[PDB]
Design an enzyme around this catalytic site. Sequence first.
Site, mmCIF file in Angstrom:
data_model
loop_
_atom_site.group_PDB
_atom_site.id
_atom_site.type_symbol
_atom_site.label_atom_id
_atom_site.label_comp_id
_atom_site.label_asym_id
_atom_site.label_seq_id
_atom_site.Cartn_x
_atom_site.Cartn_y
_atom_site.Cartn_z
ATOM 1 N N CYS A 1 18.615 41.868 -21.069
ATOM 2 C CA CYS A 1 18.904 41.011 -19.914
ATOM 3 C C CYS A 1 18.788 41.820 -18.609
ATOM 4 C CB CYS A 1 20.292 40.367 -20.081
ATOM 5 S SG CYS A 1 21.605 41.633 -20.405
ATOM 6 N N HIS B 1 26.629 41.379 -19.120
ATOM 7 C CA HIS B 1 25.180 41.418 -19.034
ATOM 8 C C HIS B 1 24.688 41.252 -17.597
ATOM 9 C CE1 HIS B 1 24.621 37.104 -18.432
ATOM 10 N NE2 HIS B 1 25.481 36.889 -19.411
#
Length: 320
Positions: A10, A79
């Site tokens: 990510c 993330h």
Amino acid sequence: DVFQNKANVCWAKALVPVLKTAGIDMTTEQWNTVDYFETDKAHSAEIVLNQLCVRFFGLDLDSGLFSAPTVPLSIRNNHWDNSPSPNMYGLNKEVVRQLSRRYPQLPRAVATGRVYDMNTGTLRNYDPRINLVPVNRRLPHALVLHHNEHPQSDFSSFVSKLKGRTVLVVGEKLSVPGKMVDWLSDRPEATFRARLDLGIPGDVPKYDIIFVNVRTPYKYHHYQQCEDHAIKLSMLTKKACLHLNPGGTCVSIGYGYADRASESIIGAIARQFKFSRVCKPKSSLEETEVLFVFIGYDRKARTHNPYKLSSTLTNIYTGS
């Protein structure tokens, strides 16, 4: 899509729109030259950005080349994404103008998404070996002249010799006679079994000694290896501080602090201990390898010992 089969990249996704401002559109094959992309591991989008900036343009982020507030890099949860945030990046055209004085062809490179070859002043297609070191940055210590292929180091004896009852070994297995040893690793034999790219689990306990027995591959340059190791310094070595008993010791494999993140992380850690040393025991064969040794976890405010560690690294790396 470029990202098919990837669970933990990510950080690479968040970067896409940032790189696009410098005309950059990474293919899967280009992402594969970032090791945490190839092995699909969690990473910092900021360290990765710094690293790509060096590869592309021979400069690190301190140059301000991506300082425009164009696209946010944010951490929602654990993330990376582009959710609104003050932590913004983007090709900065005023800086490109200023730098074009010294590097007349840099405007073309940031417009094309091509490499600015610091050695030749010309454009080039992407390869991670063209700009090995950022030219805007005064390295804080010397780097080795040569790197060779030696057998992996063994630090059993060195850890045995440290004052302390309880030992947490992080990463690779290490037997340490005379000490109570917990082993933190993704290996199924581990005492605490965890993904290391996530860092030290908050649920692990406190120790008199923590050893970060983690290495990073030398691929093509000392600078490369030191910057690849940075995320590990941050995720393991830095977090290890929260798992030391008062006056405990932290020990960590390392390669110096050629890059800015490492330098920042080591300083953050060093300033928490009564003593900070760099050692290279007669067991450390690899030329770029050192142990960072932090003794006496006391979090008392004292004066900055920064050139000490640098001098020692410099002497080690030039052989002196």
